[PDB]
Amino acid sequence: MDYTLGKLNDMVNWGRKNSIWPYNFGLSCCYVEMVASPRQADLMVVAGTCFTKMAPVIQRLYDQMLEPKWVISMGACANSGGMYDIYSVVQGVDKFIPVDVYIPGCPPRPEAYMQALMLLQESIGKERRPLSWVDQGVYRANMQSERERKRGERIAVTNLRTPDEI
Amino acid sequence: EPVYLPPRYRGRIVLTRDPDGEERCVACNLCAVACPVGCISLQKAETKDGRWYPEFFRINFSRCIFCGLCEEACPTTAIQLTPDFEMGEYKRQDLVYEKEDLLISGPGKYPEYNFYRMAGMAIDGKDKGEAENEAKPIDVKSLLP
Amino acid sequence: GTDFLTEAHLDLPMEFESIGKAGSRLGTALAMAVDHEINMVSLVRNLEEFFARESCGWCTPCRDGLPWSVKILRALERGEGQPGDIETLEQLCRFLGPGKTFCAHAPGAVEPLQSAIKYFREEFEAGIKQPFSNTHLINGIQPNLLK
Amino acid sequence: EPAWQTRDHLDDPVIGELRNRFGPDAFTVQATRTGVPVVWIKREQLLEVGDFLKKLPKPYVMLFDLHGMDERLRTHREGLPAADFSVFYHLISIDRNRDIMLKVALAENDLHVPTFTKLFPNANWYERETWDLFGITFDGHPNLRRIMMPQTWKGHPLRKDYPARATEFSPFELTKAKQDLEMEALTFKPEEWGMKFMFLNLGHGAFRIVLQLDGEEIVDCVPDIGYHHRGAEKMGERQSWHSYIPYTDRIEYLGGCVNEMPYVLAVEKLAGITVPDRVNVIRVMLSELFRINSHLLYISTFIAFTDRQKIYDLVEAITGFRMHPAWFRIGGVAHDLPRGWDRLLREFLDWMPKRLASYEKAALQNTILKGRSQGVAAYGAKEALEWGTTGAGLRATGIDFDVRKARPYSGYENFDFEIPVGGGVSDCYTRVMLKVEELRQSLRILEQCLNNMPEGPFKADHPLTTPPPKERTLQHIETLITHFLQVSWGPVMPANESFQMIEATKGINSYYLTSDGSTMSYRTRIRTPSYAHLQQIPAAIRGSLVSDLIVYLGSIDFVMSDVDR
Amino acid sequence: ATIHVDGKEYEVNGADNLLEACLSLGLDIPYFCWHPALGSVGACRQCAVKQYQNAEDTRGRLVMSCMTPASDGTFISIDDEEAKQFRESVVEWLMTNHPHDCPVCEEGGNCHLQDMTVMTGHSFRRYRFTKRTHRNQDLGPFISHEMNRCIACYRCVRYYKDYAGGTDLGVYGAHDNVYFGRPEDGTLESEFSGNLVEICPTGVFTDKTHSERYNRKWDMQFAPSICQQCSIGCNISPGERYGELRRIENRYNGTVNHYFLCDRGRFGYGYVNLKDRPRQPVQRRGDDFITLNAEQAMQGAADILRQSKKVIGIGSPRASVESNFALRELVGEENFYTGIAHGEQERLQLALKVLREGGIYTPALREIESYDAVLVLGEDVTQTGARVALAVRQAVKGKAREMAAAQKVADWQIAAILNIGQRAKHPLFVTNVDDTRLDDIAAWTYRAPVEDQARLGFAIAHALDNSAPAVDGIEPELQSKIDVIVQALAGAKKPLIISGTNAGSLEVIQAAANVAKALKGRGADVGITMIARSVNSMGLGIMGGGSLEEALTELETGRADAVVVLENDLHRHASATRVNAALAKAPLVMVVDHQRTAIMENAHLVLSAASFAESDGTVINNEGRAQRFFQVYDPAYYDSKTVMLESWRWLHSLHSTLLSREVDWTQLDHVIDAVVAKIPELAGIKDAAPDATFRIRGQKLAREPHRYSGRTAMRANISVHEPRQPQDIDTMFTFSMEGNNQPTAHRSQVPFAWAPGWNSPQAWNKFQDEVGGKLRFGDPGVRLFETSENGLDYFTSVPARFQPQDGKWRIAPYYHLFGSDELSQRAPVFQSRMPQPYIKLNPADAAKLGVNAGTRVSFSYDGNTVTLPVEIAEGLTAGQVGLPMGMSGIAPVLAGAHLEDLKEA
Ligand code: SF4
Ligand code: SF4
Ligand code: SF4
Ligand code: SF4
Ligand code: SF4
Ligand code: SF4
Ligand code: SF4
Ligand code: FES
Ligand SMILES: [Ca+2]
Structure with a gap:
């Protein structure tokens, strides 16, 4: 598939996806729902509202993280700013750091976070990276989007339970 | 293991269909204005029989807080929040769900309601006087006093 | 266009003011009688x-x-x-x-x-012989049972 | 004469006392729906009025609130003094069980008021926030600097001519702020933070506190807050009365419906709505469920994820959401209770007594926790009153002040429950004891809710009930019209001011709403208890260790989203 | 007068009724059947209040506030319990038969019935029986009909018949089966039928053109603008959504066009949404049309202009004052040309000289309704200046108003006034080449050629004053009718003389000026009105410049090699062959325009100018009133590649890049200051609107309502990242909801009417000092010139009688409301409404030429043989041929021209 700028390459991809050490940065009320130094971490889970005062803190702790680095945004706040289109809130954490996996919700479920972990492992295993730095270009796969992959089963839904039950 | 969800669970938003099979949405734009985030955008189009429908219907799910105010404001029970939470994506542009990503094949949580059985506006299959609690139209040229 | 009167009002004079205090109007003064067989x-x-x-x-x-x-x-x-x-x-x-x-x-x-x-x-x-109702039961919506 | 009727409160004895002391032509009484005597005082008489109120036979001992209002866009100012800006001071007399709202009018060219910090020490942060968000100067304030916005911020966000929406993101400002934060310790000025030894910067919520240490002893400390500021009040001026409800949910996120309750009660006061009994019982039941959830989290964090999971399952069954239901409505609740709710509540109330006994055993009789928690950084009733402390700390000082009993709301007077109070000392162990007893009383209230639940409507029979019942909206044209205009343009609240004070999970939470006759709030003021609880920290740990500060931070119940709003 | 409402004391006008007095005080009384312009009839019974006899009265009596005078010492109660229950019951009675239609109704969110249902507090339905239904009618392309939603408030029939004078709308049927509509299917014939969509308080009559691309009122982006479709200058509120113009709402101006537009202005906005519009600068090279951005287009044009020896500019009356002035600065005053023909320019300057040097006051459009006699000379006002015709109808009904006022009848009791004044009306005398739409109320109609109409005017002036020049050869029948006109005009307190440049004759304007001067010399309070052609015709006349013929001569000889044409198609004002030859000879043609025109094929450079929806500027009224129009939306907000700048911005940047080789775009206030500095006659356009620094307590004026939706989704299909809000440095408005639109805000420019509880066009009540009066802080727009102290002399050039010559046919103009205007006839909804181009023949001329009705005849004009079908015109004088001006192929410059070789095809 398309890439945006060999057996042992599969081995390192498998090892990277099968052992991810996250650094959960909980800004706000996504943090209670989702519940290691950044030098020893490789995944940054940004959960919560990205305030203008705490945006340098997020940027600094992302800069302290070592390559390879992946970012999972939890909730509408980290995705886009959410409901807080306001003077003191940065409209999405992707305004200043790159994000690998987005999760909608306010707050999302922990199982939504686990599904995004599956998505991150798939994206890690389907990527090609420079093996040794002695081509030094990161190639990320242009994966098929989840909404078109799951479109058939979603549209095929006909009847749901009435809201008068618990 | 699968996770149980109650029938009222505020998850993935869908657009539903009437029991006759037509889409329930009349493109009345009440859900878009009732959205506190403003993440619904749609445009009204009209068929040849006069039936209102959305020409497009898009929801920015990267902005949506799943509060259910759009379902509360819908006068046709078209837009509904369903028990589904697996909606993660790779790109934020892919969280913009168009009308083909939302329109399911059935009535959803409300199995029998049809707005166009209530409205006096005439469409195909329902002329004037055939809606609920409606009398037949009486011409002003009628001989009866 | 005039108010009905009973048999007790049969003894008052057919005047404007006399029928005015009785709760009716003299009108055209062309009275109409209603018998017991009329609902x-x-x-x-x-x-x-x-x-x-x-x-x-x-x-x-x-x-x-x-x-x-x-x-x-x-x-x-x-x-x-x-x-x-x-x-x-x-x-x-x-x-x-x-x-x-x-x-x-x-x-x-x-x-x-x-x-x-x-x-x-x-x-x-x-x-009056049936209870008041102007709402159908919509499946999936619990009604607001007023008291 | 309903509870939402407009009153001037001229028969309040404080009005006659003020008239006797200062004269009949010294103040203006305003008729509101706040339930509070609202008195407009001249600026030059504010300090003597406050000192007179502090020395009454049943004195006004607590400054409940202090903030500002931009009156330049307000069109319905009939019966009000000429003001471009105003500053309001909400004061509470606990012994009198009364309260008063003083208001000072200010011209736009002269935006300065005498400081209230000499009378009430907790006025410091309130005056700092008023200066930050309105640009109102307070003469004699020790360190009048910004507390929500950074020090380099331009303008005052709560002014009516300040744009509410997010500005264009600039990486240059981000790099400048990051470089300022990197060299913050290198160019640290002790006088700029209100101080006069080593300086420590370090991070319930991520907030920075700047500490002055004599080797290891805490000599002075000033916290840097506003890192969680969401502009919820400015958003209150940007959302309709109905569409603001999820924003009320996200104030104190462990409270949920507890946070929704004062806002919907204040809007119902503006609308003139008296909700039926079933609405009161439903709201009380959800509030007590969320209070149990918050108290369980607080107790477990002081010492777990199963009883909270059962609470969240019941809340998700009722409202469709776990932590941010947004289920309360103007005039009622969003839906009726689902069939099968009573069996879920019955299974919850049978699982709970033995778990509550287990929490009592693990918390109260824990000898090491009792030794660690007793007597460390404690305060009495005088320190609680002068700092605006409410909730478990205030009742641990011995002052029996619960909103559900002193000023009953939402039908709480129809339930049988006790208000636990401590001795004269408010430390960690007494607050934990009080929260455990409040857990037991909330379980009692839930049992009473389950035993005799009223049958009736879940929405009021008022035209301003937003939204109308769904079946009549789908069936009837006039109900459809009311729904159409209520969800799109918004419900029209006639111009008034309302106030609702409730007992939240962490203290007293209040909404002060000003309607200018429109479908949007002219002014939404949220008083949160965690702000006042965080302000009193430097007065309670002065002379202690850093570990004592950590234990005190874990002992007070606060969240930074509640602090910064 | 003193009234006591709910215990409070108020000072009101005794001549007003209680409803309008209480609405002017800010009190809210629900109402349906009353309208400020239509009067009170007492139909809907919604405005009920409780009136007491005195202060010590507790019982009271329910009365209708619209039918009750606000007399001195009047005690009423609005918030009385029984009155509230009665108003709620009236709403409920209306709701019994109302269809469940709000989601699929175009009135939703803009509906007076919705607002009044909410205002009375009625939200519970206890009616359980069936609702009456109605079949709908086809009412033409503009108005959609939905008879189910009617509440039988009679507003439509009262407006359409009593106010607008229309004949094809009415009320039919009986008790609860009342039907409002036409007797049969067909297009509504009135030129003012479009005002029904705001007159009707429900969704019975809706804007069909808006219904095609419908969106709700809260989703609209509004701006206060001026209608561009003729010279009358009606204030409008264009409302857009998703980058396209979607509706034209009437914007209240108590001095000009208070509640009402004409159908041309309301429905001829569709040219803005044409897909063939230029959106980028395009340069031709060989046969390749390369697209440039703004900077390199400016640089290339500047170097190419700098290499030329003489640059000339051709303005247009379509363009604003700022754009024409920017062109005049770019090319120089000596090289600037107006772009209209020589005869059109001469008539325009004569009308202007009569306006600001004739010593006779020119009334505003609202002020026309107070004149007691009207003489219209040569101007078919219904097809050229339609709102003037509506005001003339009101002035004609002034006589019935006078006889009712003599009988102590209040001015709002319209049924009594109309009953007293059965058919008595103020004198109206219209002259035209044929029958006009004003002939139903005209005291006399004169069908004659324009020289004969001018001779009639000069004879009227001579009979009014013997110092005026006489007319020789007047027949005794025409002399008797002239004497009738003179006796009517001399006995009038306020005579009004209306003329214009559309007749194509200078002598008609001279005769109207002489009649006005003769009436002024007798001490009468005479007013004069001149109807120009286009939106900024008077501004182009005030600015001046050479004619289009001089510019074409300069291009054809070769003294000028560069021509810059601003917003001008050049074929309406000159022959097509001459324009094509001159533009093909010119090595550099630059066209700054917003519409795809035929001269863009020969254009070296095309600058995509903005239309009125996407530009700011000032336009000058037919009465000399400078009026500012504001940009509605940013065209680059959705399509980022769109480079669609203001015309004055393009030309100022071009002049800056020509002079200093660098680009400075401009600000609008800088151009306005330049206009008032270099041109002292246009110094009043500074005061037309406040500058961009104007604030309402520090905040800007909002362009969209506070509940504007989809702010994070409307552009989400292009990019999920929300773009920057567009910045407006030109004006005081912001392109967002973060602004002020309070009815009490101290301003004159109102983008849209909205108040809490009033979502309909009845929200304009809150923005006025008194209902039906002026805006609260004054109407926008100032007069450029006052009345001169001294008038003109009598024009002694009396034209000779019309003589038909063999082989030559004098072209009589036949203007149409739908078609004669250029931009409006480009609109797609006007194509169905406009008719096929016919050529009008006298029965005698058609019998001589052997052609019946409907037969195609071919004629040669300027060496071009075109064929048109023949329509027989009885009223047209023989020796004349009738042609529709403004259509494709028939320029308005053809009016008054001759015509050779009329042969059957
Ligand atoms: S997305 Fe929702 S739950 Fe998460 S931090 Fe934002 S407001 Fe809180
Ligand atoms: S659930 Fe709430 S945030 Fe999401 S689209 Fe609906 S109204 Fe908007
Ligand atoms: S509220 Fe319902 S019917 Fe109306 S536009 Fe939205 S989904 Fe469609
Ligand atoms: S006319 Fe008004 S009340 Fe009637 S259906 Fe339309 S929007 Fe609703
Ligand atoms: S007949 Fe009936 S509808 Fe007509 S005016 Fe009389 S009361 Fe009214
Ligand atoms: S069609 Fe409209 S204006 Fe005419 S009577 Fe009915 S509601 Fe009134
Ligand atoms: S009269 Fe002229 S200015 Fe007024 S709406 Fe009609 S075309 Fe526009
Ligand atoms: S507005 Fe007075 S009766 Fe209709
Ligand atoms: Ca502009």
Whole structure:
């Protein structure tokens, strides 16, 4: 598939996806729902509202993280700013750091976070990276989007339970 | 293991269909204005029989807080929040769900309601006087006093 | 367009003021007698169908409130009356009096309904036989059960 | 004469006392729906009025609130003094069980008021926030600097001419702020933070506190807050009365419906709505469920994820959401209770007594926790009153002040429950004891809710009930019209001011709403208890260790989203 | 007068009724059947209040506030319990038959019935029976009909018949089966039928053109603008959504066009949404059309202009004052040309000289309704200045108003006034080449050629004053009718003389000026009105410049090699062959325009100018009133590649890049200051609107309502990241909801009317000092010139009688409301409404030429043989041929021209 700028390459991809050490940065009320130094971490889970005062803190702790680095945004706040289109809130954490996996919700479920972990492992295993730095270009796969992959089963839904039950 | 969800669970938003099979949405734009985030955008189009429908219907799910105010404001029970939470994506542009990503094949949580059985506006299959609690139209040229 | 009077009012003189204090009008002074075989609900229904179909349509209370009283009286005729119907009729008689409508057609329309409810109320109460309902049950929506 | 009626409160004895002391032509009484005597005082008489109120036979001992209002866009100012801006001071007399709202009018060219910090020490942060968001200067304030916005911020966000929406993101400002934060310790000025030894910067919520240490002893400390500022009040001026409800949910996120309750009660006061009994019982039941959830989290964090999971399952069954239901409505609740709710509540109330006994055993009789928690950084009733402390700390000082009993709301007077109070000392162990007893009383209230639940409507029979019942909206044209205009343009609240104070999970939470006759709030003021609880920290740990500060931070119940709003 | 409402004391006008007095005080009384312009009739019974006899009265009596005078010492109660229950019951009675239609109704969110249902507090339905239904009618392309939603408030019939004078709308049927509509299916014939969509308080009559691309009122982006479709200058509120113009709403101006537009202005906005519009600068090279951005287009044009020896500019009356002035600065005053023909320019300057040097006051459009006699000379006002015709109808009904006022009848009791004044009306005398739409109320109609109409005017002036020049050869029948006109005009307190440049004759304007001067010399309060052609015709006349013929001569000889044409198609004002030859000879043609025109094929450079929806500027009224129009939306907000700048921005940047080789775009206030500095006659356009620094307590004026939706979704299909809000440095408005639109805000420019509880066009009540009066802080727009102290002399050039010559046919102009205007006839909804181009023949001329009705005849004009079908015109004088001006192929410059070789095809 398309890439945006060999057996042992599969081995390192498998090892990277099968052992991810996250650094959960909980800004706000996504943090209670989702519940290691950044030098020893490789995944940054940004959960919560990205305030203008705490945006340098997020940027600094992302800069302290070592390559390879992946970012999972939890909730509408980290995705886009959410409901807080306001003077003191940065409209999405992707305004200043790159994000690998987005999760909608306010707050999302922990199982939504686990599904995004599956998505991150798939994206890690389907990527090609420079093996040794002695081509030094990161190639990320242009994966098929989840909404078109799951479109058939979603549209095929006909009847749901009435809201008068618990 | 699968996770149980109650029938009222505020998850993935869908657009539903009437029991006759037509889409329930009349493109009345009440859900878009009732959205506190403003993440619904749609445009009204009209068929040849006069039936209102959305020409497009898009929801920015990267902005949506799943509060259910759009379902509360819908006068046709078209837009509904369903028990589904697996909606993660790779790109934020892919969280913009168009009308083909939302329109399911059935009535959803409300199995029998049809707005166009209530409205006096005439469409195909329902002329004037055939809606609920409606009398037949009486011409002003009628001989009866 | 005049109020009904009973047998006790048969002894007063046919004057404007004497019938005025009795709760009616002298009118054209051409009286009409109603015997025991006549259902008062049916008679008032016929009167109100006349008055509703002779409205000129200019003003809201007559034009859109006389047919409501006609439909209520038809329901009472068929034994399909519901609670609140007689209260709705009394509200219609109160809100179609002089000054409320553009002309005097609707006060004359509501005079016999007023007098018949005042005197022969038992037939109007006998017309009510089913509970009040104007809402269908929508599946998936719990109703707001008012008390 | 309903509870939402407009009153001037001229029969309040404080009005006659003020008239006797200062004269009949010294103040203006305003008729509101706040339930509070609202008195407009001249600026030059504010300090003597406050000192007179502080020395009454049953004195006004607590400054409940202090903030500002931009009156330049307000069109319905009939019966009000000429003001471009105003500053309001909400004061509470606990012994009198009364309260008063003083208001000072200010011209736009002269935006300065005498400081209230000499009378009430907790006025410091309130005056700092008023200066930050309105640009109102307070003469004699020790360190009048910004507390929500950074020190380099331009303008005052709560002014009516300040744009509410997010500005264009600039990486240059981000790099400048990051470089300022990197060299913050290198160019640290002790006088700029209100101080006069080593300086420590370090981070319930991520907030920075700057500490002055004599080797290891805490000598002075000033916290840097506003890192969680969401502009919820400015958003209150940007959302309709109905569409603001999820924003009320996200104030104190462990409270949920507890946070929704004062806002919907204040809007119902503006609307003139008296809700039926079933609405009161439903709201009380959800509030007590969320209070149990918050108290369980607080107790477990002081010492777990199963009883909270059962609470969240019941809340998700009722409202469709776990932590942010947004289920309360103007005039009622969003839906009726689902069939099968009573069996879920019955299974919850049978699982709970033995778990509550287990929490009592693990918390109260824990000898090491009792030794660690007793007597460390404690305060009495005088320190609680002068700092605006409410909730478990205030009742641990011995002052029996619960909103559900002193000023009953939402039908709480129809339930049988006790208000636990401590001795004269408010430390960690007494607050934990009080929260455990409040857990037991909330379980009692839930049992009473389950035993005799009223049958009736879940929405009021008022035209301003937003939204109308759904079945009549789908069936009836006038109900459809009311729904159409209520969800799109918004419900029209006639111009008034309302106030609702409730007992939240962490203290007293209040909404002060000003309607200018429109479908949007002219002014939404949220008083949160965690702000006042965080302000009193430097007065309670002065002379202690850093570990004592950590234990005190874990002992007070606060969240930074509640602090910064 | 003193009234006591709910215990409070108020000072009101005794001549007003209680409803309008209480609405002017800010009190809220629900109402349907009353309208400020239509009067009171007491139909809907919604405005009920409780009136007491005195202060010590507790019972009271329910009365209609619209039918009750606000007399001195009047005690009423609005918030009385019984009155509240009665108003709620009236709403409920209306709701019994109302269809469940709000989601699929175009009135939703803009509906007076919705607002009044909410205002009375009625939300519970206890009616359980059936609802009456109605079949709908086809009412033409503009108005959609939905008879189910009617509440029988009679507003439509009262407006259409009593106010607008229309004949094909009415009320039919009986008691609860009242039907409002036409007797049969067909297009509504009135030129002012479009005002029904705001007159009707429900969704019975809706804007069909808006219904095609419907969106709700809260989703609209509004701006206060001026209608561009003729010279009358009606204030409008264009409302857009998703980058396209979607509706034209009437914007209240108590001095000009208060509640009402004409159908041309309301429905001829569709040219803005044409897909063939230029959106980028395009340069031709060989046969390749390369697209440039703004900077390199400016640089290339500047170097190419700098290499030329003489640059000339051709303005247009379509363009604003700022754009024409920027062109005049770019090319120089000596090289600037107006772009209209020589005769059109001469008539325009004569009308202007009569306006600001004739010593006779020119009334505003609202002020026309107070004149007691009207003489219209040569101007078919219904097809050229339609709102003037509506105001003339009101002035004609002034006589019935006078006889009712003599009988102590209040001015709002319209039924009594109309009953007293049965058919008595103020004198109206219209002259035209044929029958006009004003002939139903005209005291006399004169069908004659324009020289004969001018001779009639000069004879009227001579009979009014013997110092005026006489006319020789007047027949005794025409002399008797002239004497009738003179007796009517001399006995009038306020005579009004209306003329214009559309007749194509200078002598008609001279005769109208002489009639006005003769009436002024007798001490009468005479007013004069001149109807120009286009939106900024008077501004182009005030600015001046050479004619289009001089510019074409300069291009054809070769003294000028560069021509810059601003917003001008050049074929309406000159022959097509001459324009094509001159533009093909010119090595550099630059066209700054917003519409695809035929001269863009020969254009070296095309600059995509903005239309009125996407530009700011000032336009000058037919009465000399400078009026500012504001940009509605940013065209680059959705399509980022769109480079669609203001015309004055393009030309100022071009002049800056020509002079200093660098780009400075401009600000609008800088151009306005330049206009008032270099041109002292246009110094009043500074005061037309406040500058961009104007604030309402520090905040800007909002362009969209506060509940504007989809802010994070409307552009989400292009990019999920929300773009920057567009910045407006030109004006005081912001392109967002973060602004002020309070009805009490101290301003004159109102983008849209909205108040809490008033979502309909009845929200304009809150923005006025008194209802039906002026805006609260004054109407926008100032007069450029006052009345001169001294007038003109009598024009002694009396034209000779019309003589038909063999082989030559004098072209009589036949203007149409739908078609004669250029931009409006480009709109797609006007194609169905406009008719096929016919050529009008006298029966005698058609019998001589052997052609019946409907037969195609071919004629040669300027060496071009075109064929048109023949329509027989009885009223047209023989020796004349009738042609529709403004259509494709028939320029308005053809009016008054001759015509050779009329042969059957
Ligand atoms: S997305 Fe929702 S739950 Fe998460 S931090 Fe934002 S407001 Fe809180
Ligand atoms: S659930 Fe709430 S945030 Fe999401 S689209 Fe609906 S109204 Fe908007
Ligand atoms: S509220 Fe319902 S019917 Fe109306 S536009 Fe939205 S989904 Fe469609
Ligand atoms: S009361 Fe009179 S005016 Fe009114 S509709 Fe009836 S008949 Fe006509
Ligand atoms: S006319 Fe008004 S009340 Fe009637 S259906 Fe349309 S929006 Fe609703
Ligand atoms: S069609 Fe409209 S304006 Fe005419 S009577 Fe009916 S509601 Fe009134
Ligand atoms: S009269 Fe002229 S300016 Fe007024 S709306 Fe019609 S075309 Fe526009
Ligand atoms: S507005 Fe007065 S009766 Fe209609
Ligand atoms: Ca502009």
